[PDB]
């Protein structure tokens, strides 16, 4: 209710809970979290820019290629990294309402 | 002693056109059809 702007609205209650009768040894209670925050892009946009740094000069690649790795694996992994950031970005800030105007295959433009 | 302006060996020459660019994603979904509907909890004949 308070932090609503930090939740994805089309998953209308984002929460799973579980509760165990047995604490760990020490203090009387505890809790453990996991978020699928779309914030995750802040890590992966850093690696991809840093990757591209190294690879736009082909820095230390001779090691990898010398174990017989092909350079089009680095190209697909980088592509799959860019496409994964695009999926983080497809569901980040996505409206509960659908997008309307976005077509380009249509047969007519006149009115 | 003139060396004839000797060139480097061997550089990032395979990267000279490289950026690289990004692909696209657009998801986006189709509506299901819910037009097969009628209620049963009333009367359509015995009302007459």
Curated annotation (Swiss-Prot), chain A:
Residues 90-111 are annotated as: Disordered. The highly acidic C-terminal region may bind cations such as calcium. The modification 5-glutamyl polyglutamate is found at residue 104. Belongs to the tubulin family. This is Tubulin beta chain. Some glutamate residues at the C-terminus are polyglycylated, resulting in polyglycine chains on the gamma-carboxyl group. Glycylation is mainly limited to tubulin incorporated into axonemes (cilia and flagella) whereas glutamylation is prevalent in neuronal cells, centrioles, axonemes, and the mitotic spindle. Both modifications can coexist on the same protein on adjacent residues, and lowering polyglycylation levels increases polyglutamylation, and reciprocally. Cilia and flagella glycylation is required for their stability and maintenance. Flagella glycylation controls sperm motility. Some glutamate residues at the C-terminus are polyglutamylated, resulting in polyglutamate chains on the gamma-carboxyl group. Polyglutamylation plays a key role in microtubule severing by spastin (SPAST). SPAST preferentially recognizes and acts on microtubules decorated with short polyglutamate tails: severing activity by SPAST increases as the number of glutamates per tubulin rises from one to eight, but decreases beyond this glutamylation threshold. The chain holds residues 335 to 445 of 445 of the full protein. Disulfide bonds: none annotated. The MREI motif is common among all beta-tubulin isoforms and may be critical for tubulin autoregulation. It is found in: Cytoplasm, Cytoskeleton.
From Swiss-Prot, chain B:
Changing residue 16 to V: In FTD1; less able to promote microtubule assembly than wild-type tau. Changing residue 12 to A: 8% decrease in microtubule-binding after in vitro phosphorylation of mutant protein. The modification Deamidated asparagine is found at residue 29. Changing residue 7 to T: In PIDB; reduces the ability to promote microtubule assembly by 70%. It comes from the Eukaryota. Expressed in neurons. Isoform PNS-tau is expressed in the peripheral nervous system while the others are expressed in the central nervous system. Tau/MAP repeats lie at residues 1-24, 25-48. There is a cross-link at residues 4, 9, 17, 31, 48 (Glycyl lysine isopeptide (Lys-Gly) (interchain with G-Cter in ubiquitin)). The modification N6-methyllysine is found at residue 9. The modification Phosphoserine is found at residues 12, 35, 43. Phosphorylation at serine and threonine residues in S-P or T-P motifs by proline-directed protein kinases (PDPK1, CDK1, CDK5, GSK3, MAPK) (only 2-3 sites per protein in interphase, seven-fold increase in mitosis, and in the form associated with paired helical filaments (PHF-tau)), and at serine residues in K-X-G-S motifs by MAP/microtubule affinity-regulating kinase (MARK1, MARK2, MARK3 or MARK4), causing detachment from microtubules, and their disassembly. Phosphorylation decreases with age. Glycans are attached at residues 9, 30-31. The modification N6-acetyllysine is found at residues 9, 31, 40, 48. The record marks 4, 7, 17, 24, 40, 44, 48 as: Not glycated. It is found in: Cytoplasm, Cytosol; Cell membrane; Cytoplasm, Cytoskeleton; Cell projection, Axon. It is linked to In Alzheimer disease, the neuronal cytoskeleton in the brain is progressively disrupted and replaced by tangles of paired helical filaments (PHF) and straight filaments, mainly composed of hyperphosphorylated forms of TAU (PHF-TAU or AD P-TAU). O-GlcNAcylation is greatly reduced in Alzheimer disease brain cerebral cortex leading to an increase in TAU/MAPT phosphorylations. Frontotemporal dementia 1: A form of dementia characterized by pathologic finding of frontotemporal lobar degeneration, presenile dementia with behavioral changes, deterioration of cognitive capacities and loss of memory. In some cases, parkinsonian symptoms are prominent. Neuropathological changes include frontotemporal atrophy often associated with atrophy of the basal ganglia, substantia nigra, amygdala. In most cases, protein tau deposits are found in glial cells and/or neurons. Promotes microtubule assembly and stability, and might be involved in the establishment and maintenance of neuronal polarity. The C-terminus binds axonal microtubules while the N-terminus binds neural plasma membrane components, suggesting that tau functions as a linker protein between both. Axonal polarity is predetermined by TAU/MAPT localization (in the neuronal cell) in the domain of the cell body defined by the centrosome. The short isoforms allow plasticity of the cytoskeleton whereas the longer isoforms may preferentially play a role in its stabilization. It comes from Homo sapiens.
């Amino acid at each position: 209710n308070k932090n609503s702007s930090y939740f994805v609205e089309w998953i209308p209650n984002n929460v799973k809970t579980a509760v165990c009768d047995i604490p760990p040894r020490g203090l009387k209670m505890s809790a453990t979290f996991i978020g699928n925050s779309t914030a995750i892009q802040e890590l992966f946009k850093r690696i991809s820019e840093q990757f591209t740094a190294m690879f736009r000069r082909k820095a230390f690649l001779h090691w990898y290629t010398g174990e017989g790795m092909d350079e089009m694996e680095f190209t697909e992994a980088e592509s799959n990294m860019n496409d994964l950031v695009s999926e983080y970005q497809q569901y980040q800030d996505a409206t509960a309402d659908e997008q309307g105007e976005f077509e380009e295959e249509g047969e007519e433009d006149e009115a | 002693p003139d060396l004839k302006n000797v060139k480097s060996k061997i550089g990032s020459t395979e990267n000279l056109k490289h950026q690289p660019g990004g692909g696209k994603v657009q998801i986006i979904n189709k509506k299901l059809d819910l037009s097969n509907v009628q209620s049963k909890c009333g009367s359509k004949d015995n009302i007459k």
